[PDB]
C-alpha cells in the first residue's frame, strides 16, 4: 500500500513532539513490531528515529510530521507551530530559540539529516538506520 502513503521507510521528516523544537528524523521500521505506519482506526501514525548523537524512537501521528528538505525550513516550521498554538506559554516557548545539551543534539540530528538526504533511500536506510 506504499503508494496511498505520504511516507515510506526511509524517508526524512521533521517530527513535531510536546515540549520539543521540530526535529530531523527519518521513517523506519519498529524493531518489535516490524511495521512503519499504523491507525491509533481513523488517524494515521508512523514510526520514526530521531537523529542525533542520542537516538531516539516513536510513533508520531501523520499530522505531526512534515518531510524534511533542509535547516532552512525550520524557521518557518516554529513561526507556523507558534500561529496554529492555543495557549500563549506554548505560543512563546515555540519561538524561543533551543538551548544547551538540546540545541547541540538538535544540531547533531541536522549534521546527520543533511547527509542522509544527500543519498539515496536505499543508501540511507543501509547507513542510517539505528538499530534496536
Ligand atoms: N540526540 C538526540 C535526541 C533525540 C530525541 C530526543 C527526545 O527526547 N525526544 C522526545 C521523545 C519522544 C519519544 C521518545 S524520545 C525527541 C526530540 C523529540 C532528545 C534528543
Known sequence: KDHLLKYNVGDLVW??????????CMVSADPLLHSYT????????????????????????????????????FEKL?????????????????????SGKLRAQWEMG????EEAASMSVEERKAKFTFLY
Not at 510536546?18 to 530531523?24: E, K, V
Not at 537516538?55 to 528538505?69: D, G, M, N, Q, Y
Not at 506554548?90 to 519561538?95: H, T
Open 110 to 113: 541536522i549534521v546527520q539529516a
Open 15 to 24: 517530527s513535531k513532539v510536546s515540549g520539543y523544537p521540530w526535529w530531523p
Open 38 to 73: 499504523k491507525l491509533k482506526k481513523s488517524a494515521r501514525q508512523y514510526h520514526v528515529q530521531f537523529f542525533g548523537d542520542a537516538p531516539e524512537r516513536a510513533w508520531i501521528f501523520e499530522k505531526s510530521l512534515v518531510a524534511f528538505e533542509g535547516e532552512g525550513q
Open 78 to 98: 516554529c513561526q507556523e507551530s507558534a500561529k496554529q498554538a492555543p495557549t500563549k506559554a506554548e505560543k512563546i516557548k515555540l519561538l524561543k530559540p533551543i
